[PDB]
Design a protein around this motif. Structure first.
Motif, short mmCIF file in Angstrom:
data_model
loop_
_atom_site.label_atom_id
_atom_site.label_comp_id
_atom_site.label_asym_id
_atom_site.label_seq_id
_atom_site.Cartn_x
_atom_site.Cartn_y
_atom_site.Cartn_z
N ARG A 106 -4.48 9.68 -14.77
CA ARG A 106 -3.98 8.32 -14.82
C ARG A 106 -4.32 7.73 -16.17
O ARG A 106 -5.40 7.98 -16.71
CB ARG A 106 -4.59 7.49 -13.70
CG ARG A 106 -4.23 6.04 -13.72
CD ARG A 106 -4.21 5.50 -12.32
NE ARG A 106 -4.00 4.06 -12.28
CZ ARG A 106 -4.83 3.22 -11.67
NH1 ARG A 106 -5.91 3.68 -11.07
NH2 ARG A 106 -4.58 1.92 -11.67
N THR B 28 -7.79 11.21 -11.61
CA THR B 28 -8.12 10.34 -10.50
C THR B 28 -8.19 11.05 -9.16
O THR B 28 -8.91 10.60 -8.28
CB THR B 28 -7.11 9.20 -10.39
OG1 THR B 28 -5.79 9.73 -10.35
CG2 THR B 28 -7.24 8.29 -11.57
N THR C 83 -4.31 15.21 -10.78
CA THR C 83 -3.60 14.02 -11.21
C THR C 83 -4.43 13.27 -12.25
O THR C 83 -5.62 13.04 -12.05
CB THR C 83 -3.31 13.10 -10.03
OG1 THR C 83 -2.57 13.81 -9.04
CG2 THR C 83 -2.52 11.89 -10.47
N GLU D 219 0.78 7.74 -13.59
CA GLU D 219 0.06 8.84 -12.97
C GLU D 219 0.86 10.11 -13.20
O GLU D 219 2.06 10.16 -12.91
CB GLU D 219 -0.15 8.60 -11.48
CG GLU D 219 -0.85 7.29 -11.17
CD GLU D 219 -1.39 7.23 -9.75
OE1 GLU D 219 -2.42 6.55 -9.53
OE2 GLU D 219 -0.80 7.86 -8.86
#
Length: 284
Positions: free
Chosen positions: A236, A194, A234, A116
């Motif tokens: 991922r 995400t 964020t 992440e």
RNA sequence: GUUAAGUCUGGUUUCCCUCCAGGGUAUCUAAGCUUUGAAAAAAA
């Protein structure tokens, strides 16, 4: 039909994560590129379409084509603001996707490394990709079926590989990622957002004055409104492999390469990322 | 001193495939039929 086009802005404002942003922007590009025509009593005479206010504003009553030009510039800025405000992140489908894919890869006996990474500044990934290209002349790498911006697996692999070159030599880089005679040992998925603190897209501008210009006589600002990926988003992605003695370089390479840029124009500090988390799951 | 008015500019260029692989392997004829039946000694 044409009513789809006159209503696309309303649909953007009212769905906000449930319309196809790719086709939505492609369609509103037709409005943007026929602006002067969609404003000759051909707004369908609605009441919510943002095209109304461009009949209420009087920017230049002398010359009408200049007025339409300024209205079009204002409308470009307004489209950018609309997309940045309404289209927000709902990254639950992404967490489902990555969890299901993690289970799939476990069943295939892979060692999965899920990473992440959070953007620190406004990021530009896929600036030459088509999304807003027909409005902004600039794009964002956008998956039109996840309906999300993404970071291609090939860019992540390329940045990691160029760092591993610069550190451990081209020979080790080829022992890890392969060459024209051996295939690589490390697989990368695309990176999807995400979670976020706020807006997923934000507007920005670049205004070259002296880009390919002879002298100050050639100087003139040419501003370029465009969309970028907001900070604090964020992303991922996964890294999976079989041969164990390839996780060490990956482990080492991830924290560093994200401090330095990951998308476009990192030279002026745009596409910088922080390493939020790294989990490793050894196939037992 | 007072007022009043903003004006100009709103994406450009480059890159559009490169390298390797361009067939390999097996099978390359096999089994039959290999002459048979009429004419061998003829009238002057």
């Amino acid at each position: 039909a044409i009513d789809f086009l006159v209503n696309i802005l309303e649909l953007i404002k009212e769905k906000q994560c449930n319309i196809n942003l790719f086709s939505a922007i492609s369609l509103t590009s037709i409005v943007y590129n026929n602006f002067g025509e969609f404003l000759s009593n051909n707004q369908s005479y609605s009441t919510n379409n943002p095209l109304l206010k461009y009949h209420i504003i009087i920017l230049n009553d002398k010359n009408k084509t200049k007025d339409v030009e300024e209205k079009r510039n204002i409308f470009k800025r307004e489209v950018a603001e609309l997309i940045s405000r309404n289209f927000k992140l709902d990254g639950e489908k992404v967490r489902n996707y990555f969890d299901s894919l993690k289970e799939v890869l476990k069943s295939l006996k892979y060692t999965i490394v899920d990473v992440e990474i959070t953007t620190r500044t406004r990021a530009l990934i896929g600036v030459s990709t088509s999304l807003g290209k027909l409005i902004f002349g600039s794009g964002i790498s956008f998956d039109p079926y996840m309906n999300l911006p993404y970071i291609p697996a090939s860019e992540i692999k390329g940045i990691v590989r160029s760092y591993i070159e610069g550190k451990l030599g081209e020979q080790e880089a080829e022992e890890i990622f392969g060459n024209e005679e051996r295939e690589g040992n490390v697989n990368f998925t695309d990176a999807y957002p995400t979670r976020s603190k706020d807006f997923l897209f934000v507007p920005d501008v670049i205004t070259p004055h002296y880009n390919g210009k002879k002298s100050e006589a050639d100087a003139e600002p040419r501003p370029v409104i465009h969309l970028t990926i907001a900070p604090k988003v964020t992303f991922r992605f996964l890294i999976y492999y079989k041969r164990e003695d390839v996780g060490k370089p990956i482990c080492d390479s991830m924290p560093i390469i994200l401090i330095r840029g990951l998308g476009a124009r990192s030279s002026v500090g745009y596409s910088l990322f922080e390493l939020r988390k790294i989990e490793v799951i050894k196939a037992a």
